[PDB]
Amino acid sequence: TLTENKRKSMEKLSVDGVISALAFDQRGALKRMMAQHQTKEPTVEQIEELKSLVSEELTPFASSILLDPEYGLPASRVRSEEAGLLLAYEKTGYDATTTSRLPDCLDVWSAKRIKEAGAEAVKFLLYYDIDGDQDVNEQKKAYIERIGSECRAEDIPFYLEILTYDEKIADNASPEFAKVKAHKVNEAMKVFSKERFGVDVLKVEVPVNMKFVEGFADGEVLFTKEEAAQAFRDQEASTDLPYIYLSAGVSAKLFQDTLVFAAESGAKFNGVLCGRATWAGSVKVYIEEGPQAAREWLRTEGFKNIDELNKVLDKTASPWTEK
Amino acid sequence: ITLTENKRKSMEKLSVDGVISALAFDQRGALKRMMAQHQTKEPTVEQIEELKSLVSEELTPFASSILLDPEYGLPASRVRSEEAGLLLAYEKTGYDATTTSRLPDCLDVWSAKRIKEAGAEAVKFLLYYDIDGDQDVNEQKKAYIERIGSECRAEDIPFYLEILTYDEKIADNASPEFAKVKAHKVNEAMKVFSKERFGVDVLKVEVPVNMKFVEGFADGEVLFTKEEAAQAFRDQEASTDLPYIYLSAGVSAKLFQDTLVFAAESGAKFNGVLCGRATWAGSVKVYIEEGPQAAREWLRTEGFKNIDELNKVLDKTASPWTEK
C-alpha cells in the first residue's frame, strides 16, 4: 500500500524507518515569539532569516524538516542534503468566535505546487472534535478526502496532523479536557485511518495529558500510570498507519519522558515532528545578539537539544517499515 | 494526449460515436431566477427537485448524457434514460456580486470521490475567469483548478471544466463593449486551462463571439462581419487540442442551432454541446403556472422539438473526440 515514489519519499524523510523531523512551519506563533524582545513589528526578513539559521544548523541531525511555504522556502533551500522536506498546506489558526475550526488550504498552493517546490510530503493540520457538530465534521471529512486524492495523483506522501478539541471546553489544558482527551485523540485517528482519506502518516497528540498522570504530575492527579498506559495501547490499536507524536504544552524533558513511557506501555510510534523546544532559546538570542551568536547557540545548545532527543528516539521509536 | 482505461470508458458513456450531445440541468441560481419571474412565493426544494426529474425523465432518451447538480438533482439522476451517462456539478452556484473576483468554491460536503461514488461518469466544475483580471486572483483560481484536476486524476474520472468569461470592469456580458473583447477572453482562457497541469479532459466553453452583433444574425448594431466572426472560431480551434463543447448561454434554440452551423462552416472542430436553457427554458413558466403534468406535455412536444432539432444539427456539425 505504498507506491514506489511514496516509499522513496518516506525514506528521504526518515532514518532506518524512524522519523526524527524538525518542525518549523510556525508563522503567527513564531511572529509573536519574536516581538517579545525587539520594538517595532518583526520584518519578513527576520522571519525568513532565523528559519534559515535553524534549518542550516540543525537539519544535519534531523531526518527531515517541516516548513511553511509562505516564509520557509528560503530556509528549505539551505537544509542539509541528507534531510527531507515537508511543506505545510493549511492556513494557520482558527476563528475563536466559532467552534467549527474549519480547514482551509493556502490560497495559491496545491499538492502539485508543493511537490514542485521540492517537498517530499504534503502536511496538513486539521482541528477535529469527534463529538462536535455532525455537519461540520462531514465538511471536514470531505475536505481531507480531496487532499488525500491530490496527494495520490501527485504521488507524494500525505502527513495529516490532527489536533483535538471540544466545542464546549475552552481550555485544552484543563482537567476537564484531560478526562476526554483519550476519546478525542484515538477516535479521530480511527476515522482518518480509513482508506478513503489517503493518509500516509498521522501526526497526533499523545492520548493523555501527562501533567495529570501519577509520577508525572506537579499537582492534581487524575490517572494512574496504568490508566495512562492503556490510553497508549488504545492509541496503538486505533490505526495501522505509521504515526508520529507532536509536542504540545509540555517541556522538552517531559516530552522525552513521555516517549519513554509511551514505548514502555506498548505504543509503536514511528517518530516525532517536534520543534519549538529545540530552537526555543535561539529566538531571543537572534533578536538580541548577532545572528552569528544564534549560530553558535544552535551549534551548541541547539545541537544538545536535538541530540538528546535523538538518543531517546533510538530507544523508543519503532520503524515505520514494521507496518 | 491520453486517457486512462477508466477515463476513456466514462467518456464513452457520455458520448455517441465521439460526439457529446449532453443535456445540462445543474442550474440552481439561474433556475431560481427564472422561477421567480412567474410567482410570488419563493421556490421550494420539491419544486426544484421535481422539475429537474421531469426534464431528466422526458428528454434524456434524446441525449448522450445529462449534467445535474448534487444539491437538487440526485433524484433526477436516478430516472435518466438507461442509455445516458451522468455528470455532476462540483461548484457552488453563482458568485459574489459585491466584488469582481468571482472566486471558485467547491460544494462543502462533496469531493471527486463522492461524486464518483454517486454514480457520475464525470466531474463538472464551473470557473468564472477574466484573463485580463487581477493577477493574484487568477493565481488563486489556477491553484484551485490544479487541485480539482489532481482529484480527478486520482479518482480516475473525467474532469469537465466550464469557463464563463467576464471583465472585472464591464458590468454586462451582453453589451457591445464586452462583445468586442469576448473572443480574447474566451480563447486565451482556453489556452491557459489546456495546460497539462490542470488535468482537464473536456472544456465546456462559450462560442467566442456574441452572434447578436454579427452580420446576418444581428437585429441592431453590427460589430463584426461574417469573416471576422469566423476567424474567432478558427482562433478558438487553435487555442486547444483538448475536446471542447459549447454551452448555449440561454439563447433561443434556433440561434444556438444556427451558431453551431456557423461554427462548423468556419472551421471549429467542436465535439458536441452541454446545452441547457436553449432546450428546456420554456418548461419553467409552464411548470410554475400550470403544474407538473402540463410541463410534461411541454417537454414531450416543444422540449422534444428543441432537442431533436439540436441533435439533427449536431449530426452535421460536431466533430468526434475519438478520431483525433
Ligand SMILES: [Ca+2]
Ligand atoms: Ca526524565
Ligand SMILES: [Ca+2]
Ligand atoms: Ca500539453
Ligand SMILES: [Ca+2]
Ligand atoms: Ca485545435
